[PDB]
């Protein structure tokens, strides 16, 4: 079957970069999208950016260009997102989802993982 | 690219087929021909220009062919 492990939740301190790994096996990873939607506690979830594993670059939400970075590897079929700067704002669980490349399918987030959770405090 | 300067005639060819030969063979020619059939107005002016420029049928023919070929390809 096709699924995303999303590793395990970790929490850190402000001013340091944190990493969220996200592996999806069971299908040809090249053709489909990875969306990295954030979800805050008791708030709506907003999507930030795609990553095409085969040739894609970061296409963040306008709120988040220069705030996050996205990388990937084709051999292991895993997509990496890391937070270059942790303020007090980003206290939420970050997700993964498979997306299609269809114009009507840019929002097609069919499959989701568990959700790696990160919060920041002193 | 802007698809206005195809990577053609570079000389580094091999026995194997190119990316697209069956269509790039006649793409530009068909553009010129559909232009010409759509708009015949330029033909009268081209005929006049070739005719009143110093006329030896070699010169007239080459001027007419070039002038009728350049405007469509390079609009």
């Amino acid at each position: 079957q096709v699924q995303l492990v999303q590793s395990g939740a970790e929490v850190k301190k402000p001013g340091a970069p944190v990493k969220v790994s996200c592996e999806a096996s069971g299908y040809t990873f090249t053709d489909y999208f990875i969306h990295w939607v954030r979800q805050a506690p008791g708030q709506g979830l907003e999507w930030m950016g795609w990553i095409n594993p085969i040739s894609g670059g970061t296409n963040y939400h306008p709120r988040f260009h220069g705030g996050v970075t996205m990388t990937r590897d084709t051999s292991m079929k895993v997509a990496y997102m890391e937070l270059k700067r942790l303020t007090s704002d980003d206290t939420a669980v970050y997700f993964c989802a498979r997306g299609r490349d269809f114009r009507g399918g840019y929002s097609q987030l069919d499959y989701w993982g568990q959700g790696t959770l990160v919060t920041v405090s002193s | 690219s802007v698809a206005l300067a195809p990577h053609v005639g570079m000389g580094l060819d091999t026995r194997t087929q190119t990316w697209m030969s069956a269509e790039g063979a006649w793409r530009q020619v068909e553009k010129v021909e559909t232009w010409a059939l759509r708009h015949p107005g330029f033909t009268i002016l081209a005929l006049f220009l070739a005719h009143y420029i110093g006329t030896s049928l070699t010169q007239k023919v080459v001027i007419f062919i070039l002038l009728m070929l350049v405007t469509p390809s390079m609009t």
């Binding site: 939607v37 709506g44 306008p62 929002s107 097609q108 987030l109 989701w112 959700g115 | -």
Partner: protein, 109 residues
């Protein structure tokens, strides 16, 4: 523009309640809307993988479409197990990003 959907309440007797999604002339009036319902605290699942096409969601009772600038969802025979937050997300083509909504707190009595 940006989409905003309202939170509302309902009851466990079967009744048609409409989760209306409102957008603009560039985000949802031309593109396929996508409907999500999330059981709270876990990963949301996908409810409608096209404009009016459901992959494997509860059939014959979850159906809806869109009209002009508005998209809507209709649920019938809603029981308690359907307690979920419902999300409408549309792809914005001007800003080259998908436009997720704030969320509906659909509570069923």
């Amino acid at each position: 523009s940006v989409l905003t959907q309202p939170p509302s309440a309902s009851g466990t007797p079967g009744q048609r309640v409409t989760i209306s999604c409102s957008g603009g002339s560039s985000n949802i009036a031309i593109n396929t809307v996508n409907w999500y319902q999330q059981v709270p605290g876990t990963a949301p699942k996908l409810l409608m993988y096209s404009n009016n096409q459901r992959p494997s969601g509860v059939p014959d009772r979850f159906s809806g479409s869109k009209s002009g600038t508005s998209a809507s969802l209709a649920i019938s025979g809603l029981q308690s197990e359907d307690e979920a937050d419902y999300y409408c997300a549309t792809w914005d083509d001007s800003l080259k990003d998908v436009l997720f909504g704030g969320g509906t707190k659909l509570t069923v009595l």
